[PDB]
Design goal:
The protein is about 40% helix and about 10% strand. The chain is an alpha+beta fold. The chain binds one RNA strand through helix 2. It comes from Methanosarcina acetivorans (strain ATCC 35395 / DSM 2834 / JCM 12185 / C2A).
RNA sequence: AGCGGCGUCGUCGCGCCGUCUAAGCAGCGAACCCCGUGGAGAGCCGUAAUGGCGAGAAGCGGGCGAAUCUGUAAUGGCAC
């Protein structure tokens, strides 16, 4: 998993940031959304109800970035193309 | 700089004063803040400075929003 999570971004389409993740969930192009332990649910329960799967990450948005190669923090990380990976299978 | 007085004037052409205009009414609105887009990292954008940023930067549109300024208030006062 330690390498599958990296390869999901190394050889896969993802969009980082809550705004773009919510847009991807709204328009359906995202296979799923990965959310950190600190992300609220006031807007997120709607995308939970929607057919877009919601994966929960084991750590905060601060440390979700370094494991996905981003120097910044990531809260919502909707994926577009799984690519050379089965992160969707890992989620559900 | 122009204009109108006063002063000086042994030589010079300088020195001084004035050359005005309220509130109200109407118009614009800097910063901050907010809204819509945007997607920025072997990093970018700022400030006098501290800083800001995928929990969404820059850039681009909109809204809100000052002092003051502009007109009007004009046929007032001034050696009209």
């Amino acid at each position: 998993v330690d390498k599958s999570l990296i390869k999901a971004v190394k050889t896969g389409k993802v969009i980082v940031g809550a705004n773009r993740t919510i847009d991807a969930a709204a328009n359906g192009s995202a296979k799923m959304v990965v959310l950190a332990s600190n992300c609220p649910e006031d807007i997120k329960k709607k995308i939970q109800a929607t057919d877009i799967p919601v994966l929960e990450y084991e750590g905060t948005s601060v440390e979700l970035g370094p494991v996905c190669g981003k120097p910044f923090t990531i809260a919502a990380m909707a994926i577009l193309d799984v690519g050379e990976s089965d992160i969707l299978a890992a989620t559900a």
